[PDB]
Amino acid sequence: IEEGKLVIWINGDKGYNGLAEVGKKFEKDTGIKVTVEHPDKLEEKFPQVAATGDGPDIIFWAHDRFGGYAQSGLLAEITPAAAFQDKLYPFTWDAVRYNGKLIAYPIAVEALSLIYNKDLLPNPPKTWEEIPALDKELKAKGKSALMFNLQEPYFTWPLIAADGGYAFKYENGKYDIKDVGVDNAGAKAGLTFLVDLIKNKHMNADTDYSIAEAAFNKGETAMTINGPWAWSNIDTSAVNYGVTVLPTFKGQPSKPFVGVLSAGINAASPNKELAKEFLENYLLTDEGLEAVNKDKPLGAVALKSYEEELAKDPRIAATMENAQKGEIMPNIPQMSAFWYAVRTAVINAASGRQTVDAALAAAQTNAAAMDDLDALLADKPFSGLDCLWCREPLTEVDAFRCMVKDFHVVIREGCRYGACTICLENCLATERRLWQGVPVTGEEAELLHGKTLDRLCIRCCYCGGKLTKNEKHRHVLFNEPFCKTRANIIRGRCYDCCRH
Ligand SMILES: OC[C@H]1O[C@H](O[C@H]2[C@H](O)[C@@H](O)[C@@H](O[C@H]3[C@H](O)[C@@H](O)[C@@H](O)O[C@@H]3CO)O[C@@H]2CO)[C@H](O)[C@@H](O)[C@@H]1O
Ligand SMILES: [Zn+2]
Ligand SMILES: [Zn+2]
């Protein structure tokens, strides 16, 4: 990392241009150049890159990612004077505390709200249950009731949580990573309601961020679910919009997961002092936050003095009312696994690839561990057995595949299980995304597991199948490295799984 300057990473939906202006003031005052960048998948890139001591000096993201960053020792400890701490709301500091240490600066507080087109819908619906009938009305005029991003569990979670869904139960002073509320009766109800909106053609499974945004900002749909960052583009459109409380579901409020946008400092940064000066005395000020806010709205902010200005805005009170009805996201390392698990269940259920029950049962298993994967894919009959994950009976092809792939029967509470292809593939996909491997040679693998390559059990990172002697030799012969993932596990690619 270059010494004498600041590189800052922040997400593309945020006011990076405004932040750049703060960055130019810092430069005019100190002579230090600040470069603001908005890399795709920055939150996944940061941990790969920072582990080798590269990356940005400062990284911005909601607080939920930061526990994982801190655990891996990627973040500098933040030590602001008590005077400074007093400038921000206490709960925001709590969001960036990990094992008794402050690991980032809180910037702003974020919650989803219902955004609606006053001209098309002067009085927005109070319940999710009214949408179906309302959509029918609007379709008559070539419009739709509701579009929003269904690709990200962040947007669908408020509904899933409404009737009892939850991530980790908080108890005995800590989130209990073994008590996950992802396949309880309330989650199923909420996901079932969502899936029925899709079967009945009130929404498309394919809708993503860009598609819902365009549709709303061009007057084609009456409602959308988004955060404060989205308001700036609606302003610039012809749309006359309101911001209000999310609908209820079975008479219970929708429960958004509340994020605190936070700025962490790379442990490997040689510019820690400069980073702290920038953040404390330039960004976390009335003028600094306003510069960023004018670009893309921040939502409620952590800085008391400026939040007082922002609080007069009805869109902000609506933001805070939805926030009070939701929960502050946990920052524990297990959150990544939770988010991936739910993302997959929603995508699967919405396309009909799996039932709601199957999809949530798998999500439940994935959110609470990966011990099951290791048991199934141990180093190295299935017919009539169910899938460990989704609890559905293995078809006879999936039973065959379990055998040919050289899987191991998993016993849970006395019962024997295999895995269907869908759950197995989703699980391995999450492994690659959650544990970026480092490349290793055959020699490195042999040395690590005191065993010749022909005798090492190396599995395909896509299908879980045990690589043949020739498949392993392919890696060596053609200079294609193996992958060292978690627990010193070594993965490779079978002939069939050699993507372009
Ligand atoms: O879906 C897989 C996804 O899971 C995790 O992403 C979550 C974020 O960690 C979490 O903060 C939240 O992201 C939202 C931001 O808070 C908000 O400011 C704005 O940017 O919208 C974001 C949602 O798109 O929720 C997501 C889950 O949807 C994980 O960190 C990701 O790496 C992973 O891709
Ligand atoms: Zn399954
Ligand atoms: Zn394979």
Side-chain angles (χ1 to χ4, degrees), residues 1-379 381-500:
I1 305 187
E2 182 89 343
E3 180 173 25
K5 65 183 273 249
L6 293 175
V7 180
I8 298 171
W9 285 7
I10 185 165
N11 201 52
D13 52 20
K14 301 315 194 302
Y16 54 88
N17 288 317
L19 186 63
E21 273 147 9
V22 185
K24 89 205 193 82
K25 203 182 194 315
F26 195 71
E27 177 162 18
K28 173 130 230 153
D29 294 359
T30 75
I32 302 288
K33 186 162 188 167
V34 172
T35 288
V36 185
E37 299 180 340
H38 54 94
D40 284 288
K41 301 180 196 172
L42 79 80
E43 82 291 355
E44 291 173 352
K45 288 187 201 171
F46 179 76
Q48 314 160 25
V49 128
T52 72
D54 194 22
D57 296 281
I58 303 172
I59 185 210
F60 281 84
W61 198 261
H63 73 290
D64 61 302
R65 264 295 192 160
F66 281 65
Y69 296 165
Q71 193 199 46
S72 302
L74 301 182
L75 297 178
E77 184 180 19
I78 291 309
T79 34
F84 187 83
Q85 288 196 32
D86 284 332
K87 290 186 169 190
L88 279 54
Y89 293 105
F91 82 96
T92 61
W93 289 112
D94 286 341
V96 298
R97 201 187 318 276
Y98 185 68
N99 289 342
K101 294 190 207 301
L102 296 174
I103 48 67
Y105 286 93
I107 310 300
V109 175
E110 295 169 3
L112 292 177
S113 291
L114 187 55
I115 307 181
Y116 74 99
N117 185 317
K118 306 216 201 79
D119 301 345
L120 283 183
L121 206 63
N123 312 103
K126 284 297 162 195
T127 72
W128 274 95
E129 284 95 342
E130 316 167 33
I131 273 106
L134 175 57
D135 184 62
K136 196 193 220 84
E137 243 182 327
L138 293 163
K139 286 276 168 60
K141 328 185 317 164
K143 311 276 179 187
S144 57
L146 176 71
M147 287 175 74
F148 66 102
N149 190 5
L150 301 181
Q151 308 316 304
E152 288 290 330
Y154 179 71
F155 295 78
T156 53
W157 186 253
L159 170 55
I160 296 155
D163 198 40
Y166 67 84
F168 311 96
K169 193 93 112 184
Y170 187 81
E171 196 154 353
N172 299 297
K174 76 174 165 57
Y175 291 102
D176 183 356
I177 52 169
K178 294 175 66 175
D179 190 349
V180 177
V182 150
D183 71 333
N184 69 27
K188 292 166 172 161
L191 185 52
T192 295
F193 190 82
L194 177 58
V195 165
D196 294 341
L197 295 176
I198 290 166
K199 306 175 71 184
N200 297 324
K201 297 191 185 64
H202 303 307
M203 297 197 307
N204 306 313
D206 296 321
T207 309
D208 58 20
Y209 191 96
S210 298
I211 294 172
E213 179 178 58
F216 186 85
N217 295 4
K218 287 178 193 288
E220 303 172 358
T221 183
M223 294 178 303
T224 189
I225 300 180
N226 222 314
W229 53 86
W231 304 343
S232 157
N233 284 347
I234 316 186
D235 288 352
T236 67
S237 83
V239 179
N240 188 353
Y241 72 96
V243 181
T244 194
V245 59
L246 292 154
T248 70
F249 178 58
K250 293 169 74 180
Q252 291 291 102
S254 287
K255 303 183 57 188
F257 250 146
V258 173
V260 182
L261 172 71
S262 313
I265 296 180
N266 200 329
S269 187
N271 307 294
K272 295 200 191 43
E273 279 319 318
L274 298 177
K276 303 171 188 169
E277 280 292 333
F278 173 82
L279 290 170
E280 289 192 23
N281 304 320
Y282 284 78
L283 179 38
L284 284 171
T285 71
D286 285 337
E287 328 80 73
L289 292 184
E290 177 175 55
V292 176
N293 197 70
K294 278 181 176 169
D295 189 9
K296 301 288 178 162
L298 282 167
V301 295
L303 193 67
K304 295 173 175 179
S305 67
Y306 190 53
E307 172 60 12
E308 283 153 21
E309 182 65 40
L310 295 176
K312 301 160 181 164
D313 182 338
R315 297 173 304 174
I316 296 292
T319 297
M320 289 287 89
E321 174 186 359
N322 276 315
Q324 305 308 300
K325 282 164 161 63
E327 317 267 15
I328 303 284
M329 276 184 292
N331 76 351
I332 64 184
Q334 292 73 207
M335 281 299 297
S336 277
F338 161 82
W339 284 123
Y340 284 103
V342 174
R343 180 189 173 276
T344 284
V346 181
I347 287 176
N348 285 359
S351 70
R353 197 194 187 190
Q354 290 188 310
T355 60
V356 168
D357 280 11
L360 292 185
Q364 173 83 13
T365 299
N366 287 320
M370 245 170 75
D371 296 270
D372 316 278
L373 186 64
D374 284 350
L376 176 86
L377 303 183
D379 291 359
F382 279 106
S383 346
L385 298 185
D386 296 338
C387 176
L388 170 49
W389 276 270
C390 68
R391 294 307 166 85
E392 304 255 34
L394 300 180
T395 63
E396 234 71 294
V397 164
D398 280 345
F400 175 73
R401 287 177 179 178
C402 278
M403 173 177 65
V404 73
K405 270 163 187 205
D406 245 308
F407 285 176
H408 286 288
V409 163
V410 175
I411 324 284
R412 283 306 180 265
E413 316 314 350
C415 297
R416 300 161 63 235
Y417 300 100
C420 70
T421 296
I422 295 177
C423 300
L424 164 72
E425 302 219 326
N426 291 147
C427 191
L428 284 172
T430 295
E431 173 179 270
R432 303 190 304 270
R433 263 147 220 175
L434 206 53
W435 281 282
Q436 262 280 302
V438 320
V440 289
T441 62
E443 169 184 29
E444 284 175 87
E446 290 183 340
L447 204 52
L448 190 68
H449 297 284
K451 264 189 215 254
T452 193
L453 187 71
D454 285 349
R455 287 179 44 201
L456 266 173
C457 184
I458 298 168
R459 291 177 178 279
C460 183
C461 61
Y462 296 101
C463 68
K466 193 191 299 170
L467 264 65
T468 59
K469 282 165 174 83
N470 284 337
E471 280 169 341
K472 279 178 294 200
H473 289 153
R474 178 198 63 84
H475 278 265
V476 176
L477 239 66
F478 291 78
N479 200 29
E480 195 184 291
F482 296 96
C483 187
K484 190 181 91 203
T485 220
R486 86 206 147 65
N488 276 313
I489 292 171
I490 312 283
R491 307 279 202 216
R493 308 156 74 212
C494 59
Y495 284 133
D496 292 350
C497 295
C498 273
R499 356 233 116 245
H500 290 224

